[PDB]
Write an enzyme that holds these catalytic residues in place. Structure first.
Site, PDB file in Angstrom:
ATOM      1  N   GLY D  69       0.796  -1.211   0.000  1.00 24.82           N
ATOM      2  CA  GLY D  69       0.000   0.000   0.000  1.00 24.82           C
ATOM      3  C   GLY D  69       0.832   1.265   0.000  1.00 24.82           C
ATOM      4  N   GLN D  70       2.034   1.189  -0.563  1.00 28.63           N
ATOM      5  CA  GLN D  70       2.895   2.358  -0.650  1.00 28.63           C
ATOM      6  C   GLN D  70       2.293   3.390  -1.597  1.00 28.63           C
ATOM      7  N   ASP D  71       2.594   4.663  -1.329  1.00 27.28           N
ATOM      8  CA  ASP D  71       2.078   5.737  -2.171  1.00 27.28           C
ATOM      9  C   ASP D  71       2.591   5.613  -3.599  1.00 27.28           C
TER      10      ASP D  71
END
Ligand SMILES: Nc1nc2c(ncn2[C@@H]2O[C@H](COP(=O)(O)OP(=O)(O)OP(=O)(O)O)[C@@H](O)[C@H]2O)c(=O)[nH]1
Ligand SMILES: Nc1nc2c(ncn2[C@@H]2O[C@H](COP(=O)(O)OP(=O)(O)OP(=O)(O)O)[C@@H](O)[C@H]2O)c(=O)[nH]1
Ligand SMILES: [Mg+2]
Ligand SMILES: [Mg+2]
Lengths: 415, 18, 178, 180, 180
Positions: D69-71
């Site tokens: 769920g990294q940007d």
């Protein structure tokens, strides 16, 4: 400190490239071919090129020139050694050096290139050891590379323990046109094909002059080898201490030591040739070959190359012994003799035509080269004394060795 | 047989030098 | 061609994946700009077969500067491969990490380099010694911050003579530019 | 043509199926995948890249592609939308401030016309703290009932315990497979 | 009685034999035993107790019982004199002050009436430093020629190199075995 080692082709196409540092752009290879053409056409062609701030130092192989780009002041000798090691590895893996295998063995070639050198620093170069980690038809790397002994793979087992030696002699004679020999050096070649079980530690012993003097036996025939080049398995410290040749032989054929000493004896073959070349009319070749070698030795496949005229045609050969054939591709008379007994004397009387019109430019005087190869003849007189084959398990070895005498740089300067 | 000189067996060491 | 190659590379069959990888390697070696398919080969990266992994690593190294943005999808794979039990896989991963000419990728590779610096495998030790020198050449400040000079100095004083020689060569190269 | 080989393969089980693993970072995705594949709570660093694994259950090889769920990795989920048959979303009820971001990301991913056959799979992750809501409050907040033509199923799984994973797998198998 | 089984066993090799390993502490005994058994220079702590091993060479299992040279272990060599067929003594030419002690210990051990069939086996250990003497100066100092009814053989072995171990083993086999 090579930046990118690449393999080119005869038409300028890069067969394979593998950058190691990336400090040089891959597009600089395009100027390598024009630069080589300019250097060759102007006489400035050299194995080390220079494309601005990047140098292209490489050698020409059988079918392609292995150009290795570099940018910093990298060791040119190191680059040449890496190229030689790569050529040897390719020859071991692929029986032929041509473009047919470059485009067919890329899967293993890329792996070998990646594993051999990293960041411009080669780490593994043993073909026998490398064959156990990269195959064209992967397990953990063998401990031999990590271990000190990188030239003797452990666990090798054979039904018999037979080691075949080959004492190859190279008779090189530089005879000037005046009849005097300038460069007369003989280089020994001890090539051994070790095939035993385990990792024996060979204890080489020969009749060296230095060893005989040190032991006190400096009165018999001792080889005065000016230069002795031991192999990687041979311990340099042992030879430096008391001339102790102690090393672990590998599995297969390899060069252990390479003796090289000057020769002050009479030539094995003495060639007396005459040139009765008429001015655009005819030519005479009063060539007489005298064998100064021992009568007990026979020079199998004697090939005395006599350079005939380049434009000569309709030649006739009046010789005594041996097949005489003129090769238009080589433009010389090949004095081919199958068996030449020691002390034999062959007399030849050549006669060939020549065009009336003179040639536009001179062609030079190629030297006469003899291709004599007399086996079972040790000109230097060096004889192997002993070979200490020691194994931890304990076995009885059956070492073997043969002495072969051939002519090396044995060329005769023309008049 | 073999061209270039028949192979000969090699010794183990200089027995006369101890 | 390109669409067929992409479809073959996006298949679940290893037999077609190997053929597609070989064809992609040949096209690049044959002089075909296959950098447009780098993201497509990115999905087929974590493979059990070592034969396809080497080709993928070579393509990524040769297709790293061209598409640095598309190379952001390989840090996790490199981290996973940096702990493989096989020393050869770890050495290949270390070599590929140092060969990747990515400025935003070398920052996250400091931990794997530190982990592999004290590797017991001599091949792993040599690979880490080469990777440290490569990182220092690429980024001297990052190498100095990571404190790899102390590890390199102790490398010469350890076992594995090949690893010691490699560490000495890396230290000489670093001091040569220093 | 003959389909005897296909019938023989189906007599003992031939269908495998696929699955996706998406969600915010530190949402139990890697731990959930490790529990599904191995059966132990394996502690892993944040998923910089992605994790691909397969689960063998009920004669179906459920291949799972974990996605962080990294940007910078949130817009990279479109790469996995190609040749994808399933989609499982793991919610993070322990992050009240991140609940809105997760809902927005789910809406953005569900607003793709290529990802239409992938049924909704809501996983109630982090089911170990008292702050976690029920199986309907989270769904009501996310408005899962407003997804027209979408077959969604809410399942709560505890990362420390692992309860409800079998129920979620059975529901996924029943949604994917329309046979006995 | 029938001795067909004994003849069949002897046709392919049946004799094994025994051997002893005695000498002063730090005399290369453990390293020599490791080289004979394994073939590598293994670094070991001083032999507080004893080391027992066997060597398979020439179809004879040469069992070796290493004995340390500790002061409290010097009188413990009488335990190994029972059921012992061989005896090998390792000299320490690098210890001039300990040479007299080693000679006295060898004389004391050789002055036992039970140890009579064990032939003398003098090993020239520490054959790596220039201070080491020849194969006769040490024997002359120890007076090995004064051992009546004793078959002694002096062999020099280098711990770092290992040369002469094969010769010593061959001499021991020739002394123990009186056959072709
Ligand atoms: N103690 C505990 N922690 C949990 C639980 N559920 C989720 N977590 C947290 O969720 C994280 C799970 O991270 P990973 O297993 O590595 O996989 P991930 O959820 O995709 O996280 P990223 O890799 O960053 O994307 C852990 O670090 C935990 O802190 C739980 O039930 N108990
Ligand atoms: N470097 C070197 N040391 C040797 C050599 N020969 C003997 N030594 C010394 O001899 C010692 C051998 O000890 P061990 O191998 O443990 O066996 P040991 O001789 O019975 O000694 P103890 O166990 O104390 O009775 C080593 O510690 C060395 O210091 C040699 O050739 N080279
Ligand atoms: Mg994760
Ligand atoms: Mg000991």
């Amino acid at each position: 400190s090579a930046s990118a080692v690449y393999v080119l082709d005869l038409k300028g196409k890069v067969l394979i490239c593998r950058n190691y540092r990336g400090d040089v752009d891959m597009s600089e290879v395009e100027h390598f071919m024009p630069i080589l053409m300019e250097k060759e056409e102007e006489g400035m062609l050299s194995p080390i090129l220079a494309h601005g701030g990047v140098r292209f130092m490489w050698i020409k192989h059988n079918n392609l020139y292995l150009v290795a780009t570099s940018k910093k002041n990298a060791c040119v000798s190191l680059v040449f050694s890496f190229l030689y090691k790569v050529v040897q590895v390719f020859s071991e893996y692929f029986k032929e050096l041509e473009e047919e295998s470059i485009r067919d063995n890329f899967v293993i070639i890329y792996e070998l290139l990646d594993e051999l050198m990293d960041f411009g620093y080669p780490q593994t170069t043993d073909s026998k050891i490398l064959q156990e980690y990269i195959t064209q038809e992967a397990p953990r790397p063998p401990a031999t590379v990590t271990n000190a002994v990188s030239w003797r793979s452990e666990g090798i087992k054979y039904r018999k323990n037979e080691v075949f030696l080959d004492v190859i002699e190279a008779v090189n004679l530089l005879v000037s046109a005046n009849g005097n020999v300038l460069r007369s050096e003989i280089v020994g070649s001890i090539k051994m094909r070790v095939f035993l079980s385990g990792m024996p530690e060979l204890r080489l012993g020969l009749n060296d002059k230095v060893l005989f003097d040190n032991t006190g036996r400096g009165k018999s025939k001792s080889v005065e080898l000016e230069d002795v080049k031991f192999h990687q398995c041979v311990r340099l410290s042992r030879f430096e201490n008391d001339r102790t040749i102690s090393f672990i032989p590998p599995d297969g054929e390899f060069e252990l030591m390479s003796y090289r000493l000057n020769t002050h004896v009479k030539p094995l073959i003495w060639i007396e040739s005459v040139i009765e070349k008429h001015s655009h009319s005819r030519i005479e070749y009063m060539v007489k070959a005298k064998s100064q070698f021992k009568r007990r030795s026979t020079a199998n496949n004697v090939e005395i190359h006599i350079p005939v005229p380049n434009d000569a045609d309709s030649p006739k050969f009046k010789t005594t012994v041996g097949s005489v054939k003129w090769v238009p591709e080589n433009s010389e008379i090949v004095w081919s003799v199958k068996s030449f007994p020691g002390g034999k004397e062959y007399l030849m009387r050549a006669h060939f035509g020549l065009p009336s019109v003179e040639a536009e430019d001179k062609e030079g005087k190629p030297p006469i080269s003899v291709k004599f190869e007399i086996p079972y003849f040790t000109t230097s007189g060096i004889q192997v004394r002993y070979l200490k084959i020691i194994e931890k398990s304990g076995y009885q070895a059956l070492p073997w060795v043969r002495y072969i005498t051939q002519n090396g740089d044995y060329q005769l300067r023309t008049q | 047989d073999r061209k270039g000189g028949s192979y000969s067996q090699a010794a183990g060491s200089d027995s006369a030098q101890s | 061609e390109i669409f067929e190659l992409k479809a073959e590379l996006n298949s679940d069959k290893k037999e077609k994946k190997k053929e597609a990888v070989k064809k992609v390697i040949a096209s690049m070696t044959v002089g075909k700009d296959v950098s447009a398919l780098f993201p497509d080969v990115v999905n087929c990266m974590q493979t059990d077969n070592l034969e396809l992994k080497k080709l993928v690593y070579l393509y990524l190294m040769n297709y790293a500067k061209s598409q640095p943005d598309m190379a952001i999808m390989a840090v996790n794979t490199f981290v996973k491969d940096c702990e493989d039990p096989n020393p050869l896989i770890r050495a290949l991963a270390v070599r590929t990490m140092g060969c990747i000419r990515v400025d935003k990728i070398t920052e996250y590779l400091c931990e794997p380099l530190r982990k592999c610096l004290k590797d017991e495998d001599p091949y792993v030790r040599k690979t880490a010694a080469v990777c440290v020198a490569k990182l220092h050449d690429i980024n001297a400040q990052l190498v100095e911050d990571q404190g790899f000079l102390d590890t390199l100095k102790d490398l010469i004083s350890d076992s594995n003579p090949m690893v010691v020689a490699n560490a000495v060569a890396a230290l000489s190269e670093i001091a040569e530019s220093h | 043509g003959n389909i005897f080989a296909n019938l023989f393969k189906g007599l003992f089980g031939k269908k495998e199926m696929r699955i996706l693993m998406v969600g915010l970072d530190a949402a139990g995705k890697t731990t959930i995948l490790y529990k599904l594949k191995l059966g132990e709570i394996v502690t892993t660093i944040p998923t910089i890249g992605f994790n691909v694994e397969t689960v063998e259950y009920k004669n179906i090889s459920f291949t799972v592609w974990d996605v962080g769920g990294q940007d910078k990795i949130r817009p990279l989920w479109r790469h996995y939308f190609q040749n994808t048959q399933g989609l499982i979303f793991v919610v993070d009820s322990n992050d009240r401030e991140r609940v809105n971001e997760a809902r927005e990301e789910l809406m953005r991913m569900l607003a793709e016309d290529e990802l239409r056959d992938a049924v909704l799979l809501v996983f109630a992750n982090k089911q170990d703290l008292p702050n976690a809501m029920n199986a309907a409050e989270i769904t009501d907040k996310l408005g899962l009932h407003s997804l027209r033509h979408r077959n969604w199923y809410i399942q709560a799984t505890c990362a420390t315990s692992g309860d409800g994973l079998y129920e979620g797998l059975d529901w996924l198998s029943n949604q994917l497979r329309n046979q006995k």
